[PDB]
Design a protein around this ligand. Structure first.
Ligand code: ADP
Lengths: 193, 322, 97, 48, 435
């Protein structure tokens, strides 16, 4: 918005070149990071599926090895990012945009190959039948980070909008509704056990 | 004679020889104590394996008969021949009740589905066709093989059919919706024969290959593929992985099947030998010098302790298992 | 596979890029017939849910308004009319001046 | 003699550098992606 | 400079630098003025230099200077110190990547690394199968920043082959100084290996168009793009050539204007001692498959070398153009014996001799035209194996129908002629109906 406001200003002619250069820089930054956030989220909830499940290796072997290849490439890219975590440095990484697009396509292809696994996992918890494939994948993959599961409880329960957790986020102390009404469990449920 | 441990023994019971051309395939009647053998002289001779006496010849095919099969009841016999026709035989009256055309080339396999209402056949025009038993109409056509399809075999419940071809691949199809469930390509040569695993062998296969028990309880249908690279491979249809490779044959494998008890694998090849495989340890137990020329086919009786093998020497041999 | 309206509503609900913090208005500019507008019966009712045939139910966020811009309601049923707040724009509203 | 030149290159190297050009190279790369996937290999660069 | 980089605390001193420079100057004079001549002429040049020079020289009474490198410390060290009697893994017996180190091999690799590091074009000259491609690839393994691309020249070769290679492996990018041709990958020097540089036809006016093209690309650092008449400058592109001696049939002497930019190294055939070393190492690695046969490695290698030498002298290009014998045939001999011995758990000496004879027949007799030549090959195989392997069953290992096949078994084992005939009759019966 500041660049556009400078463009509409009359004194912009002398500063056209640098303003255009920074506009290009910002546009490429946004274009990269919009793909980056989705790629990161998909990898986050796919690694949980492919590591926390022991039977997925035997039921889905080809996609299993595919995901280890994709995850190894992703971790190599992440290590390169961690080496020089400056935003221009990762922006100027050779072929970062094309690599991100390839990673997004590969993760999407892997995600669409998990339909049978999620359909079979639905039988264990019956309320998973009212949760979509994307949200179910997020739930199962991100079971460790229970802070981000609070938005999926309204789709599975009549009035349980969120759950109440302790400081460690390891024992479930109760449930809550949309209006803030809370029910405190007499015997709290331990996630660690 | 352990009711699920007998294997064939070297001294043959009978050596039946009435065919004028190489015996293509031999099968057992599911109910009666009678045997049927197809040969290249366009004849289907019927033998009794308790006393080893010829009974009658089923003629009507113009060219060499390539395959024969029985329905569950044993009241119908379906035979395919090199003259591009499939004939259905009323095995009570021994008359051909229906002839089915529609394949464009040599029909090299035929199988009656377990329900007994459909006939599946493979031919040299690279297609697999389904025929109604009652009407004789072609109702389905499984295309996708790139070469001559050599065999077609339905599974126990008839929901899946496997096929092998000269294109060195084994394809598993879905009967209901025609889709190709799997494409098993690991043989380095043409795949000759296939066979499904009986449910009595599922636990044995699982504990021999080390496969962990699935949460369903169904290990997944298992398939075999003898091929011309002298090897036998056991597949898991559900995952498409080759569980084991059985090496030891000296020539092209022609037929392969399980022991009815699901403890051993019986295979015959062109090395003139019939071999008993202990797939528990992935090794061959017994080797039988079966015939004096190529051994084309074998069958293992479901209940009685008898093995029969046909051969190119125009001789059908019955083996007592002890 | 999500349709246009389902995709828009799901993207707003997920709020990956802070959609829940804005004023999201979905305007249906076009004709209304019971074939497509009756699927919004739960959306425009107190349920505030978009029920899909696959069993998924999408709750309407409090910042989202479903809007219809139409010229006539000669084919909409009573179920659609009773579920929405009506604003009538007579032709005298926009004078030639 | 061009036949023999192509044979010489193909026999010695197993590949002809100028055989696939333009759209043919793109089609070949797509088919090689498919084949490498069918052989359990992930290959993305056209130089691999 | 590299040594000074390796010793920041103790750079090179003036006296050590002077000694090293003198020794390296003599070494370079030898390898530049005699690198393209036989061993005798290298020895003659070394003797002449020893007579005329004043620098310190090795004190060996008979070992010529060409066997001594120049250590960075500034003293002559023999090349034999870099030639160890290695033990090859049994699964890497006579593999294409495997190079058994030898005096000639290490000397040529050092010289090529010296020339390749400067990005100077070079040509390896020698008889076919002498080891030019092997030596070049082994030397290129020491230069990770170089990608080699193989080109095979023929009598119909034109610059279009090089242009197609450039289109595949390189890109024409526009720069302010002009168009520049560089490899698609970055930081790597493309090496164009041209295997038959002196085969391309000379016209009636005595010139090879591709040789002129390469000379223009080397001297002027670029060429002309004939589509738009734009000068194209090469970047990070290197040329290496190989060729048979120009006196060979079908070979033409290269232009003197092309040779001045290209040093030539002569890679002759390994001698009987070098052949014995290399293929005795290969046989020792081989015969560990069957421990009972381990004691026969030396006589087996001796018989192989003797028969190879006799066949090489007996059959030459004067009789037939394809009568070319090289260490490549010895490598195929080793590979065939290894592949026949691999699935066998145990084997008597007579079986090993029969496999040796079968491979000798398949390598040296199949290409012969006349029947007298094949009779000579049979008789001399028999005599060689009798000479080097006495006290063995002559008939059991030399039944003249020496046939080996994996058609009647899972392995490569000897097959009887009648059994093979019956099997082939049955297979033909199937073949008629199928194909
Ligand atoms: N020192 C050595 N170690 C291993 N193999 C050798 C050695 N010297 C020669 N050879 C054999 O000689 C052959 C040389 O062939 P090659 O290098 O292709 O010749 P050219 O370059 O003339 O075509 C190779 O097959 C190699 O096995």
């Amino acid at each position: 918005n500041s660049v556009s406001a400078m463009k509409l200003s009359p004194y912009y002619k002398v500063f056209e070149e640098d303003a255009l250069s920074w506009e290009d820089k910002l546009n490429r930054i946004m274009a990269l990071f919009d793909v980056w956030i989705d790629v990161q989220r998909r990898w986050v909830y796919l690694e949980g599926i492919f590591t926390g499940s022991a039977d997925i290796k035997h039921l889905l072997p080809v996609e299993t090895q595919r995901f280890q290849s994709i995850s190894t490439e992703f971790l190599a890219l992440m290590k390169k990012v961690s080496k020089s975590p400056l935003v221009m440095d990762v922006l100027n990484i050779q072929g970062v945009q094309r690599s991100l697009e390839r990673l997004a396509d590969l993760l999407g292809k892997i995600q669409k190959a998990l339909g049978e696994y999620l359909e079979r996992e639905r039988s264990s918890f019956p309320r998973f039948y009212f949760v979509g494939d994307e949200d179910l994948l997020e739930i199962i993959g991100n079971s460790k980070n229970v802070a981000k599961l609070q938005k999926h409880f309204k789709k599975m329960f009549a009035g349980v909008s969120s759950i109440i957790l302790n400081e460690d986020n390891s024992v479930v102390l109760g449930i809550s509704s949309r209006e803030g009404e809370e029910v405190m469990f007499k015997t709290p449920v331990s996630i660690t056990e | 004679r352990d009711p699920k441990e007998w294997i064939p023994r070297p001294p043959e019971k009978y050596a039946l020889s009435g065919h004028r051309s190489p015996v293509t395939r031999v099968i057992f009647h599911p109910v009666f104590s009678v045997m049927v053998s197809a040969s290249e002289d366009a004849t289907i001779k019927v033998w009794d394996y308790e006393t080893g006496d010829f009974e009658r010849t089923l003629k009507g095919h113009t060219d060499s008969v390539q395959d024969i099969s029985f329905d569950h009841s044993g009241k119908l016999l379906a035979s395919c021949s090199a003259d591009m026709t499939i004939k259905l035989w009323d095995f009570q009256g021994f008359e051909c009740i229906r002839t089915m055309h529609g394949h464009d080339h040599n029909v090299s396999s035929v199988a009656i589905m377990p329900n007994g209402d459909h006939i599946v056949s493979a031919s040299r025009d690279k297609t697999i066709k389904m025929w109604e038993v009652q009407t004789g109409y072609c109702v389905k056509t499984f295309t996708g093989h790139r070469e001559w399809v050599r065999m077609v075999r339905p599974n126990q419940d008839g929901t899946l059919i496997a096929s092998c071809s000269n294109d060195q691949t084994v394809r598993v199809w879905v009967v209901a919706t025609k889709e190709c469930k799997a494409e098993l390509r690991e043989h380095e040569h043409v795949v000759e024969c296939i066979s499904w695993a009986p449910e009595s062998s599922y636990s044995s296969i699982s504990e021999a290959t080390g496969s962990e028990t699935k949460k369903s309880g169904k290990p997944g249908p298992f398939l075999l593929s003898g091929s011309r690279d002298k090897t036998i491979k056991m597949w898991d249809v559900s995952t498409g992985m080759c569980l084991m490779t059985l090496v030891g044959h000296d020539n092209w494998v022609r037929g392969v099947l399980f022991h009815s008890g699901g403890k051993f694998i019986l295979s015959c090849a062109d090395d003139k030998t019939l071999r008993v495989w202990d797939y528990k340890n992935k090794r061959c137990m017994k080797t039988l010098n079966a015939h004096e020329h190529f051994v084309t086919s074998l069958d293992f009786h479901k209940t009685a302790p008898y093995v029969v093998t046909g051969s190119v020497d125009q001789t059908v041999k019955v083996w007592e298992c002890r | 596979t999500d349709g246009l309206f389902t995709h828009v509503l799901r993207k707003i609900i997920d709020s990956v890029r802070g959609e829940l913090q804005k004023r999201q208005w979905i305007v249906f500019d076009g004709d209304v017939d019971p074939e497509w507008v009756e699927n919004l019966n739960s959306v425009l009712d107190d349920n505030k849910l978009l029920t899909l045939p696959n069993g998924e139910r999408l709750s309407l966020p409090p910042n989202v308004r479903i809007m219809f811009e139409v010229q006539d309601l000669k084919y909409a049923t009573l179920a659609t009319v009773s579920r929405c707040g009506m604003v009538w724009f007579s032709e005298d509203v926009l004078s030639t001046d | 003699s061009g036949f023999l030149e192509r044979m010489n290159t193909l026999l010695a190297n197993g590949e002809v550098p100028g055989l696939f050009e333009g759209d043919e190279y793109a089609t070949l790369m797509t088919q090689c992606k498919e084949g490498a996937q069918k052989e359990g290999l992930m290959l993305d660069s056209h130089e691999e | 400079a590299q040594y000074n980089a390796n010793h920041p605390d103790f750079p090179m001193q003036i006296e050590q630098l002077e000694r090293y420079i003198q020794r390296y100057l003599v070494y370079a004079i030898l390898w530049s003025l005699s690198g393209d001549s036989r061993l005798k002429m290298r020895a003659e040049l070394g003797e002449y230099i020893r007579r005329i020079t004043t620098v310190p020289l090795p004190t060996a009474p008979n070992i010529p200077i060409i066997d001594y490198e120049v250590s960075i410390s500034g003293e002559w060290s023999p090349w034999q110190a870099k030639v160890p009697q290695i033990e090859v893994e049994t699964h890497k017996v006579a593999a294409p990547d495997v190079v058994v180190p030898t005096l000639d091999t290490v000397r040529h690799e050092a010289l090529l690394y010296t020339w390749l590091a400067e990005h100077k074009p070079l040509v390896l000259c020698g008889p076919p199968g002498s080891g030019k491609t092997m030596t070049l690839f082994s030397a290129l393994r020491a230069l990770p920043d170089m990608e080699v691309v193989g080109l095979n020249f023929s009598s119909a070769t034109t610059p279009e082959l090089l242009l197609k290679t450039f289109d595949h492996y390189c890109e024409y990018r526009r720069t302010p100084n002009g168009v520049v041709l560089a490899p698609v990958q970055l930081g790597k020097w493309l090496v164009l290996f041209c295997d038959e540089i002196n085969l391309p036809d000379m016209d009636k006016y005595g010139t090879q168009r591709v040789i002129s093209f390469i000379r223009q690309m080397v001297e002027h650092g670029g060429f002309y793009r004939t589509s738009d008449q734009t000068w194209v400058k090469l970047e990070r592109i290197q040329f290496v050539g190989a060729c048979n001696p120009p006196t060979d049939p079908g070979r033409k002497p290269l232009s003197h204007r092309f040779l001045r930019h290209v040093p030539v190294v002569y890679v002759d055939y390994p001698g009987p001692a070098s052949l014995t070393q290399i293929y005795g190492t290969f046989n020792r690695a081989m015969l560990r498959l069957i421990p009972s046969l381990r004691t026969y490695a030396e006589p087996l290698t001796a018989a192989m070398v003797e028969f190879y030498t006799m066949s090489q002298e007996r059959f030459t290009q004067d009789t037939q153009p394809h009568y070319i014998y090289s260490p490549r045939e010895m490598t195929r001999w080793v590979r065939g014996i290894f592949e026949a011995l691999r699935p066998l758990e145990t084997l008597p000496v007579e079986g090993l001799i029969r496999i040796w004879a079968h491979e000798a027949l398949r390598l040296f007799q199949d290409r012969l035209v006349e029947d007298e030549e094949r009779r000579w090959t049979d008789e001399n195989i028999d005599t060689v194996a009798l000479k080097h392997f006495p006290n063995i069953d002559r008939e059991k290992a030399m039944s003249r129908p020496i046939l080996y096949s994996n058609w009647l078994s899972k392995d490569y084992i000897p097959v009887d002629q009648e059994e093979l005939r019956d099997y082939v009759k049955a297979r033909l019966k199937v073949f008629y109906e199928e194909e």
